[PDB]
Design a protein around this ligand. Structure first.
Ligand code: HEC
Length: 79
C-alpha cells in the first residue's frame, strides 16, 4: 500500500524526515537504500537481522508483510 502512509507511525522515532538517529542511534533511515531497507525489514520481519533495538523494530515490522515492506522501503529510500 502507500509507503508514506505505512511509515507514518515509524516517523515518531525516525523523525518526519526519517533522519533522526532513532533512539538507540539508528543510521539515518533516509535513503538508506530501498534494497537495504527492504532486506533489513525482511530480516526483522522473519527475525534474521539485528540492531540496537531490533526487538522494537521486529515488533513494529511484524504489522507488515513483503508487499507492505517493499512499499515502506521504497518510501524510506526517497523519504
Ligand atoms: C523507536 C523505538 C523506533 C520505532 C518506533 C521504529 N523504529 Fe525503525 N529503527 C529503530 C532503530 C534504533 C533502528 C536502527 C537499527 C538498530 O536497532 O540499531 C531502526 C531501523 C529501521 C530500519 C533500517 C534498518 C537499519 O539497519 O537501520 C527500517 C527499515 C525501519 N527502522 C523501519 C521501521 C518501521 C517500518 C517502523 C514503523 C512501524 C519503525 N521502524 C519504527 C528504531 C525505531
Amino acid at each position: 500500500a502507500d509507503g508514506a502512509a505505512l511509515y507514518k507511525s515509524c516517523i515518531g522515532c525516525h523523525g518526519a524526515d526519517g533522519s533522526k538517529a532513532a533512539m538507540g542511534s539508528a543510521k539515518p533511515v533516509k535513503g538508506q537504500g530501498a534494497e537495504e531497507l527492504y532486506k533489513k525489514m525482511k530480516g526483522y520481519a522473519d527475525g534474521s537481522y539485528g540492531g540496537e533495538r531490533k526487538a522494537m523494530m521486529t515488533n513494529a515490522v511484524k504489522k507488515y508483510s513483503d508487499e507492505e515492506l517493499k512499499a515502506l522501503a521504497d518510501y524510506m529510500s526517497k523519504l
